[PDB]
Amino acid sequence: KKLTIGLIGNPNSGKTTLFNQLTGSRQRVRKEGQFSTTDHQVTLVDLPGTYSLTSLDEQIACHYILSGDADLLINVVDASNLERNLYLTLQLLELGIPCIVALNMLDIAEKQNIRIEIDALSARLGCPVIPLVSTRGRGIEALKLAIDRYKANENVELVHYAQPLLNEADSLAKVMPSDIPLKQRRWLGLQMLEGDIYSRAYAGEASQHLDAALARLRNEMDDPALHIADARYQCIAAICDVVSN
Amino acid sequence: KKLTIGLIGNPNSGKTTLFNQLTGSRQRVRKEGQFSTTDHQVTLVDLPGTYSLTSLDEQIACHYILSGDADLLINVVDASNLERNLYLTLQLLELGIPCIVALNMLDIAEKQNIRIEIDALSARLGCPVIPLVSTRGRGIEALKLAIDRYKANENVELVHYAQPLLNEADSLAKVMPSDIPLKQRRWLGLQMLEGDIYSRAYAGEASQHLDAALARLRNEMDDPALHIADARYQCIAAICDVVS
Amino acid sequence: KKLTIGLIGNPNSGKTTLFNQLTGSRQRVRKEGQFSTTDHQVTLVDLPGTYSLEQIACHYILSGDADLLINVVDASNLERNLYLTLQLLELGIPCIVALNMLDIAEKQNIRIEIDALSARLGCPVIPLVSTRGRGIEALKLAIDRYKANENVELVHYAQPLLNEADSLAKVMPSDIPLKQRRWLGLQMLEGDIYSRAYAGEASQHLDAALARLRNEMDDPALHIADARYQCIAAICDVVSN
Ligand SMILES: CNc1ccccc1C(=O)O[C@H]1C(=O)[C@H](n2cnc3c(=O)[nH]c(N)nc32)O[C@@H]1COP(=O)(O)OP(=O)(O)NP(=O)(O)O
Ligand SMILES: CNc1ccccc1C(=O)O[C@H]1C(=O)[C@H](n2cnc3c(=O)[nH]c(N)nc32)O[C@@H]1COP(=O)(O)OP(=O)(O)NP(=O)(O)O
Ligand SMILES: CNc1ccccc1C(=O)O[C@H]1C(=O)[C@H](n2cnc3c(=O)[nH]c(N)nc32)O[C@@H]1COP(=O)(O)OP(=O)(O)NP(=O)(O)O
Ligand SMILES: [Mg+2]
Ligand SMILES: [Mg+2]
């Protein structure tokens, strides 16, 4: 079976280095690439670097991600700035898109005395985590194995939102276009409530209900947007707390 | 929703420090405090330091734990003396009280190059293990999340006792007051065969069988109390080697 | 209950050293020993070092005297040691991996996530350090808690290789379990010399099998070899350094 995979991560996380290591001379300027694993023929897409789906390169990556084109994503993460990198990781995982986290720059992490508990991160993200040193090629045989074994991400609980935030997000979600997966509709709901403007273009006509939703939320919490951001940071921090000491 | 959490740990593990970090000035003096999480309003109780549940401080904590006042416990554990601190941990988990182990003193354990594999510990304990990192509020952050996600401890076997010890503590448990849960009744029977005074008071009519129970045990094994302590030390040393 | 446990591993792993501490003896570093765990009286069989499947330890395994094995593995040379580890687990022999020589690995500065290895192997992994006796408590406890290995997929072979190994196994002797038969048919396609002794009826299908594979993959024996290398190197990169 043929597969389409997008490389997604922060700028300077090692995406191109990984792209070259996997494809080499089998590349075309979007930048596409071809390689073959044991079971699959792969098309690899070098998406432009981004910190958050929320900025000319940012919009290119975002629309592609939401389209549902690629079967699987290789989320390239810099191990030496784990916290900052995990914001994008969490977005992809909250969106329910099949993910493999490629832990890159482990040699820099090690030099800076940063140790990461791989399995513990995997347990909390709910997807495979593969250590990598892309410049030396170390870890490639493991990443290919992960692709062959790729199942759906564990439906593990990522962000623990206040219950009224979930109620209002699902209320907004049930009104967005039918062709969008519920998991993506709920996330878009959250985005809108937080103040993400660009997020409205994908929410169809649900934006009309936004201002009244926040009015309702202001009766049960001090600042709805603050509570969203709080819950998200708590998720990132709790991961780093257990995973990286 | 109101939750009541008790802080239990060895002397000098950092209970009050964590108590003060969680509650701030929302505290009165026993020392009780107040702090909120995403889903709950939490009442935190700072219990006295004790090495075991087996002076007054041993009874104060132990009587509190068995009273069922607390919905769950935060077990503050010194990371720089893991083996010493885990005896209490093993006891709470044998009791079946919902526990969250909080690893404190990360700085000291760093000084003497101690590394602990957190998830490996969690798996063998059956409860979450939360490091108390102070940078960027990571510890408190993770602790609060664990409180909102608290459930019953995982039913993983902890200590491996010899069969006659299990059979004997089991029969004693079948005799104790029916207003106490079974898992607690089994643990009480285990403590009695070791020779605990505080247990026999809780045990009631079970203490009438103790002499018969010990005698019956004395045929197969020479010393039951030692065998209980040894199996507990075995389990603790076994955990420490796989985990650090 | 009585149990027979065999000590298997590479040459110079601490295999005989572990035999000395578990039993209560001292030997120059096949001998039998005796020790009692909490629930069992255990007969411990020390075997000579072997990298693969030297002929001394080879027979003791593929016979059926032992109920469980203690696979002694050097932590300083994990990648080298795991080839045998993988063999025992692909055969589905109940075993407890005993990581030894951790003081040497720590001196060379190598860190291992023990539970991440254990999850991938599907069996208990116990850190030791024999000379400075440490993991003896955790090992005895692992024996008492013995059970079947986890049905986790180890090596990822190409689908056509699996089809061939399957069809060979279906005609193989009935007395041997499926997991042992599937491994043998897969050793035949790689070209294992001392395999036809157990193949029985599978030899009259071996010639046609190879030709059916070579029509759709350019080296069946190397793909078997490559897949095993990939599996070991994947495990090592995710777990160590
Ligand atoms: C020749 N310049 C350098 C001198 C010293 C150190 C690094 C470089 C260098 O070439 O920078 C790259 C590199 O190889 C170095 N690097 C990549 N992977 C590794 C790695 O795995 N380990 C180490 N030590 N360094 C690495 O990081 C840098 C960025 O990598 P990418 O361009 O692949 O990252 P990207 O995500 O494609 N950026 P973008 O397209 O979003 O803007
Ligand atoms: C501010 N005074 C001090 C100056 C230098 C060293 C210690 C102190 C001190 O006040 O002692 C405490 C402290 O901050 C120090 N400490 C607490 N946490 C840490 C910690 O995380 N790192 C270091 N280095 N020291 C810590 O430990 C000591 C005991 O902490 P707790 O009272 O929280 O422990 P407890 O379990 O409530 N005692 P108890 O009620 O069982 O008898
Ligand atoms: C006598 N001392 C030596 C002098 C030169 C080179 C090596 C040693 C030596 O350490 O001998 C043993 C030892 O203490 C040392 N050693 C053993 N265990 C440990 C160990 O756990 N840690 C450290 N640091 N050293 C260890 O290496 C040797 C272990 O040999 P075994 O027979 O136990 O290994 P084996 O797998 O049974 N031999 P084989 O039949 O498989 O071929
Ligand atoms: Mg690039
Ligand atoms: Mg105190």
mmCIF file of C-alpha atoms in Angstrom, chain B:
data_model
loop_
_atom_site.group_PDB
_atom_site.id
_atom_site.type_symbol
_atom_site.label_atom_id
_atom_site.label_comp_id
_atom_site.label_asym_id
_atom_site.label_seq_id
_atom_site.Cartn_x
_atom_site.Cartn_y
_atom_site.Cartn_z
ATOM 1 C CA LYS B 1 -16.847 19.049 44.633
ATOM 2 C CA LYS B 2 -15.095 18.741 47.996
ATOM 3 C CA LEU B 3 -12.049 16.466 48.372
ATOM 4 C CA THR B 4 -10.044 15.854 51.522
ATOM 5 C CA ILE B 5 -6.402 14.899 51.048
ATOM 6 C CA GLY B 6 -3.947 13.961 53.800
ATOM 7 C CA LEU B 7 -0.204 14.478 53.414
ATOM 8 C CA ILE B 8 1.666 11.465 54.789
ATOM 9 C CA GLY B 9 5.430 10.918 54.752
ATOM 10 C CA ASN B 10 8.584 10.146 56.713
ATOM 11 C CA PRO B 11 9.959 12.842 59.036
ATOM 12 C CA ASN B 12 11.779 15.572 57.048
ATOM 13 C CA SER B 13 10.516 14.652 53.567
ATOM 14 C CA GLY B 14 9.087 18.127 52.868
ATOM 15 C CA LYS B 15 5.411 17.771 53.837
ATOM 16 C CA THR B 16 4.959 21.278 55.273
ATOM 17 C CA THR B 17 6.893 22.834 52.374
ATOM 18 C CA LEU B 18 4.483 21.218 49.884
ATOM 19 C CA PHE B 19 1.566 22.064 52.197
ATOM 20 C CA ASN B 20 2.636 25.723 52.162
ATOM 21 C CA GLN B 21 3.150 25.692 48.385
ATOM 22 C CA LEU B 22 -0.325 24.277 47.779
ATOM 23 C CA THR B 23 -2.290 26.313 50.338
ATOM 24 C CA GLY B 24 -0.325 29.563 50.823
ATOM 25 C CA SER B 25 -1.979 31.529 53.633
ATOM 26 C CA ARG B 26 -5.296 29.634 53.293
ATOM 27 C CA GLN B 27 -4.273 27.525 56.315
ATOM 28 C CA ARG B 28 -5.105 27.240 60.023
ATOM 29 C CA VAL B 29 -3.597 25.446 63.043
ATOM 30 C CA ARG B 30 -3.270 19.724 63.462
ATOM 31 C CA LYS B 31 -2.724 21.901 60.368
ATOM 32 C CA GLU B 32 -5.481 22.119 57.726
ATOM 33 C CA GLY B 33 -5.423 24.067 54.457
ATOM 34 C CA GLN B 34 -7.494 24.987 51.399
ATOM 35 C CA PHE B 35 -6.668 24.992 47.684
ATOM 36 C CA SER B 36 -8.674 24.520 44.497
ATOM 37 C CA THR B 37 -8.099 22.449 41.372
ATOM 38 C CA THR B 38 -9.935 22.327 37.992
ATOM 39 C CA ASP B 39 -12.715 20.049 39.272
ATOM 40 C CA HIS B 40 -12.463 20.105 43.067
ATOM 41 C CA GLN B 41 -12.150 22.253 46.158
ATOM 42 C CA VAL B 42 -9.512 20.461 48.214
ATOM 43 C CA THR B 43 -8.993 20.346 51.957
ATOM 44 C CA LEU B 44 -5.391 19.375 52.698
ATOM 45 C CA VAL B 45 -4.367 17.912 56.069
ATOM 46 C CA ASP B 46 -0.705 17.981 57.105
ATOM 47 C CA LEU B 47 -0.148 14.835 59.193
ATOM 48 C CA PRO B 48 2.911 14.350 61.458
ATOM 49 C CA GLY B 49 6.027 12.641 60.086
ATOM 50 C CA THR B 50 6.178 8.882 60.644
ATOM 51 C CA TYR B 51 8.413 6.042 59.411
ATOM 52 C CA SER B 52 5.701 3.376 59.706
ATOM 53 C CA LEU B 53 2.094 2.566 60.618
ATOM 54 C CA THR B 54 3.141 -0.712 62.277
ATOM 55 C CA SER B 55 5.546 7.288 69.906
ATOM 56 C CA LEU B 56 2.234 9.088 69.235
ATOM 57 C CA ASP B 57 3.022 10.193 65.650
ATOM 58 C CA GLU B 58 2.744 6.585 64.420
ATOM 59 C CA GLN B 59 -0.766 6.307 65.909
ATOM 60 C CA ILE B 60 -1.869 9.835 64.900
ATOM 61 C CA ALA B 61 -1.304 9.146 61.196
ATOM 62 C CA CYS B 62 -2.453 5.505 61.381
ATOM 63 C CA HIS B 63 -5.723 6.259 63.216
ATOM 64 C CA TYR B 64 -6.333 9.046 60.702
ATOM 65 C CA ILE B 65 -5.705 6.731 57.718
ATOM 66 C CA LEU B 66 -8.135 4.062 58.984
ATOM 67 C CA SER B 67 -10.829 6.621 59.904
ATOM 68 C CA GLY B 68 -11.582 7.145 56.201
ATOM 69 C CA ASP B 69 -11.675 10.931 56.574
ATOM 70 C CA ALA B 70 -9.373 11.256 53.556
ATOM 71 C CA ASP B 71 -10.610 10.383 50.063
ATOM 72 C CA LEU B 72 -6.976 10.026 48.987
ATOM 73 C CA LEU B 73 -3.423 10.565 50.242
ATOM 74 C CA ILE B 74 -0.431 12.397 48.835
ATOM 75 C CA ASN B 75 2.576 10.364 49.913
ATOM 76 C CA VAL B 76 5.584 12.675 50.015
ATOM 77 C CA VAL B 77 8.696 10.574 49.471
ATOM 78 C CA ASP B 78 12.327 11.637 49.825
ATOM 79 C CA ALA B 79 13.993 10.721 46.516
ATOM 80 C CA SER B 80 17.472 10.739 48.100
ATOM 81 C CA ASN B 81 16.512 7.926 50.511
ATOM 82 C CA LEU B 82 14.049 5.955 48.382
ATOM 83 C CA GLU B 83 14.457 2.572 50.134
ATOM 84 C CA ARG B 84 13.816 4.032 53.619
ATOM 85 C CA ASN B 85 10.767 6.022 52.456
ATOM 86 C CA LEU B 86 9.099 3.140 50.585
ATOM 87 C CA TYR B 87 8.283 1.077 53.694
ATOM 88 C CA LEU B 88 5.500 3.540 54.538
ATOM 89 C CA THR B 89 4.511 3.628 50.847
ATOM 90 C CA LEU B 90 4.195 -0.156 50.751
ATOM 91 C CA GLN B 91 1.954 -0.036 53.834
ATOM 92 C CA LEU B 92 -0.463 2.568 52.435
ATOM 93 C CA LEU B 93 -0.754 0.655 49.173
ATOM 94 C CA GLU B 94 -1.325 -2.601 51.063
ATOM 95 C CA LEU B 95 -4.146 -0.780 52.876
ATOM 96 C CA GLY B 96 -5.743 0.081 49.523
ATOM 97 C CA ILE B 97 -6.117 3.812 50.246
ATOM 98 C CA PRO B 98 -5.985 5.788 46.949
ATOM 99 C CA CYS B 99 -2.425 7.148 46.806
ATOM 100 C CA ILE B 100 -0.384 9.635 44.809
ATOM 101 C CA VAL B 101 3.343 9.342 45.509
ATOM 102 C CA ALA B 102 5.072 12.709 45.243
ATOM 103 C CA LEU B 103 8.844 12.563 44.774
ATOM 104 C CA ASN B 104 10.454 15.407 46.680
ATOM 105 C CA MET B 105 14.081 16.426 47.353
ATOM 106 C CA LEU B 106 15.040 16.147 43.653
ATOM 107 C CA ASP B 107 17.944 18.526 44.274
ATOM 108 C CA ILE B 108 19.568 16.299 46.935
ATOM 109 C CA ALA B 109 19.121 13.143 44.838
ATOM 110 C CA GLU B 110 20.782 15.061 41.986
ATOM 111 C CA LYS B 111 23.798 15.954 44.182
ATOM 112 C CA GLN B 112 24.571 12.270 44.790
ATOM 113 C CA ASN B 113 23.796 11.108 41.230
ATOM 114 C CA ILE B 114 20.575 9.205 41.967
ATOM 115 C CA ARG B 115 18.407 8.395 38.944
ATOM 116 C CA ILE B 116 14.864 7.008 39.284
ATOM 117 C CA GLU B 117 12.762 5.669 36.407
ATOM 118 C CA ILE B 118 9.415 7.236 37.367
ATOM 119 C CA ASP B 119 7.055 5.133 35.203
ATOM 120 C CA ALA B 120 8.733 1.884 36.276
ATOM 121 C CA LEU B 121 8.066 2.867 39.894
ATOM 122 C CA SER B 122 4.475 3.870 39.128
ATOM 123 C CA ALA B 123 3.803 0.521 37.458
ATOM 124 C CA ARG B 124 5.131 -1.492 40.407
ATOM 125 C CA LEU B 125 3.277 0.690 42.952
ATOM 126 C CA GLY B 126 -0.040 0.815 41.067
ATOM 127 C CA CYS B 127 -0.361 4.554 41.628
ATOM 128 C CA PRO B 128 0.931 7.765 39.990
ATOM 129 C CA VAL B 129 4.454 8.942 40.802
ATOM 130 C CA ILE B 130 4.817 12.729 40.571
ATOM 131 C CA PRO B 131 8.201 14.498 40.819
ATOM 132 C CA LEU B 132 8.083 17.840 42.649
ATOM 133 C CA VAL B 133 9.988 20.006 40.147
ATOM 134 C CA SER B 134 9.926 23.681 41.152
ATOM 135 C CA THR B 135 10.926 25.111 37.740
ATOM 136 C CA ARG B 136 7.967 26.708 35.914
ATOM 137 C CA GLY B 137 5.513 25.254 38.461
ATOM 138 C CA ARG B 138 5.824 21.765 36.962
ATOM 139 C CA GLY B 139 5.456 19.811 40.231
ATOM 140 C CA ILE B 140 2.303 21.569 41.478
ATOM 141 C CA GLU B 141 0.982 21.489 37.906
ATOM 142 C CA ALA B 142 1.403 17.701 37.651
ATOM 143 C CA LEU B 143 0.130 17.084 41.185
ATOM 144 C CA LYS B 144 -3.103 19.002 40.512
ATOM 145 C CA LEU B 145 -3.711 17.056 37.287
ATOM 146 C CA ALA B 146 -3.227 13.762 39.151
ATOM 147 C CA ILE B 147 -5.747 14.894 41.809
ATOM 148 C CA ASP B 148 -8.411 15.551 39.138
ATOM 149 C CA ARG B 149 -7.701 12.169 37.542
ATOM 150 C CA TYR B 150 -7.516 10.219 40.791
ATOM 151 C CA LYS B 151 -9.018 6.742 40.745
ATOM 152 C CA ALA B 152 -8.529 3.554 42.771
ATOM 153 C CA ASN B 153 -4.966 2.222 42.878
ATOM 154 C CA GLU B 154 -4.143 -0.428 40.266
ATOM 155 C CA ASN B 155 -4.614 -3.974 41.582
ATOM 156 C CA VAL B 156 -0.967 -5.004 41.102
ATOM 157 C CA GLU B 157 0.503 -7.496 43.587
ATOM 158 C CA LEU B 158 3.007 -5.774 45.856
ATOM 159 C CA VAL B 159 4.522 -8.084 48.469
ATOM 160 C CA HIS B 160 4.889 -11.800 47.868
ATOM 161 C CA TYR B 161 4.114 -13.557 51.148
ATOM 162 C CA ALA B 162 4.452 -17.285 51.789
ATOM 163 C CA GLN B 163 1.125 -19.111 51.447
ATOM 164 C CA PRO B 164 0.587 -20.005 55.162
ATOM 165 C CA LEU B 165 1.013 -16.283 55.976
ATOM 166 C CA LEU B 166 -1.688 -15.379 53.443
ATOM 167 C CA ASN B 167 -4.022 -18.154 54.645
ATOM 168 C CA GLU B 168 -3.580 -17.104 58.280
ATOM 169 C CA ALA B 169 -4.061 -13.357 57.775
ATOM 170 C CA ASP B 170 -7.037 -14.254 55.575
ATOM 171 C CA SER B 171 -8.838 -16.297 58.254
ATOM 172 C CA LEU B 172 -8.262 -13.569 60.878
ATOM 173 C CA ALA B 173 -9.766 -11.041 58.447
ATOM 174 C CA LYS B 174 -12.913 -13.164 58.041
ATOM 175 C CA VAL B 175 -13.475 -12.669 61.788
ATOM 176 C CA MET B 176 -12.991 -8.894 62.230
ATOM 177 C CA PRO B 177 -15.817 -6.269 62.417
ATOM 178 C CA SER B 178 -17.979 -6.218 59.271
ATOM 179 C CA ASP B 179 -17.933 -2.391 59.178
ATOM 180 C CA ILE B 180 -14.335 -2.447 57.884
ATOM 181 C CA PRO B 181 -13.501 -3.192 54.201
ATOM 182 C CA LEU B 182 -11.982 -6.592 53.334
ATOM 183 C CA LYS B 183 -8.618 -5.305 52.038
ATOM 184 C CA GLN B 184 -8.118 -3.350 55.277
ATOM 185 C CA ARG B 185 -9.165 -6.412 57.301
ATOM 186 C CA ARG B 186 -6.565 -8.575 55.542
ATOM 187 C CA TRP B 187 -3.826 -6.013 56.248
ATOM 188 C CA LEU B 188 -4.833 -5.853 59.929
ATOM 189 C CA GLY B 189 -4.437 -9.641 60.161
ATOM 190 C CA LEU B 190 -1.000 -9.404 58.572
ATOM 191 C CA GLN B 191 0.055 -6.773 61.133
ATOM 192 C CA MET B 192 -1.108 -8.914 64.075
ATOM 193 C CA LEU B 193 1.055 -11.893 63.083
ATOM 194 C CA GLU B 194 3.971 -9.445 63.018
ATOM 195 C CA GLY B 195 3.032 -8.348 66.554
ATOM 196 C CA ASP B 196 1.387 -4.919 66.222
ATOM 197 C CA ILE B 197 -0.445 -3.549 69.282
ATOM 198 C CA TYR B 198 -2.586 -0.945 67.470
ATOM 199 C CA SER B 199 -4.039 -3.621 65.179
ATOM 200 C CA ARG B 200 -5.412 -5.938 67.891
ATOM 201 C CA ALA B 201 -7.542 -3.058 69.213
ATOM 202 C CA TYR B 202 -9.096 -2.569 65.753
ATOM 203 C CA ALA B 203 -9.295 -6.352 65.295
ATOM 204 C CA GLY B 204 -11.688 -6.974 68.207
ATOM 205 C CA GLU B 205 -12.628 -10.664 68.450
ATOM 206 C CA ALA B 206 -9.844 -11.574 66.002
ATOM 207 C CA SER B 207 -7.231 -11.237 68.770
ATOM 208 C CA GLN B 208 -8.743 -14.347 70.401
ATOM 209 C CA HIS B 209 -7.439 -16.409 67.463
ATOM 210 C CA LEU B 210 -3.951 -14.842 67.317
ATOM 211 C CA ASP B 211 -2.291 -17.319 69.714
ATOM 212 C CA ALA B 212 -3.860 -20.253 67.858
ATOM 213 C CA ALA B 213 -2.866 -18.632 64.541
ATOM 214 C CA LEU B 214 0.788 -18.141 65.538
ATOM 215 C CA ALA B 215 1.011 -21.673 66.956
ATOM 216 C CA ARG B 216 -0.541 -23.128 63.790
ATOM 217 C CA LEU B 217 2.015 -21.105 61.779
ATOM 218 C CA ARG B 218 4.893 -22.224 64.034
ATOM 219 C CA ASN B 219 4.755 -25.742 62.555
ATOM 220 C CA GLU B 220 5.735 -24.731 59.000
ATOM 221 C CA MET B 221 7.904 -21.667 59.733
ATOM 222 C CA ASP B 222 10.108 -20.872 62.744
ATOM 223 C CA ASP B 223 9.328 -17.137 62.976
ATOM 224 C CA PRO B 224 6.286 -15.574 61.203
ATOM 225 C CA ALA B 225 6.961 -11.929 62.169
ATOM 226 C CA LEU B 226 10.447 -12.032 60.622
ATOM 227 C CA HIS B 227 9.102 -13.666 57.447
ATOM 228 C CA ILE B 228 6.587 -10.826 57.019
ATOM 229 C CA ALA B 229 9.265 -8.140 57.455
ATOM 230 C CA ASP B 230 11.714 -9.990 55.175
ATOM 231 C CA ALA B 231 9.178 -10.320 52.349
ATOM 232 C CA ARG B 232 8.475 -6.596 52.700
ATOM 233 C CA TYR B 233 12.197 -5.781 52.578
ATOM 234 C CA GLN B 234 12.500 -8.177 49.612
ATOM 235 C CA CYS B 235 9.768 -6.303 47.732
ATOM 236 C CA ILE B 236 11.302 -2.899 48.526
ATOM 237 C CA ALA B 237 14.852 -3.924 47.555
ATOM 238 C CA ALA B 238 13.420 -5.552 44.409
ATOM 239 C CA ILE B 239 11.649 -2.337 43.409
ATOM 240 C CA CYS B 240 14.730 -0.173 44.116
ATOM 241 C CA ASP B 241 16.973 -2.275 41.840
ATOM 242 C CA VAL B 242 14.663 -2.215 38.809
ATOM 243 C CA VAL B 243 13.767 1.457 39.360
ATOM 244 C CA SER B 244 17.173 2.970 40.228
#
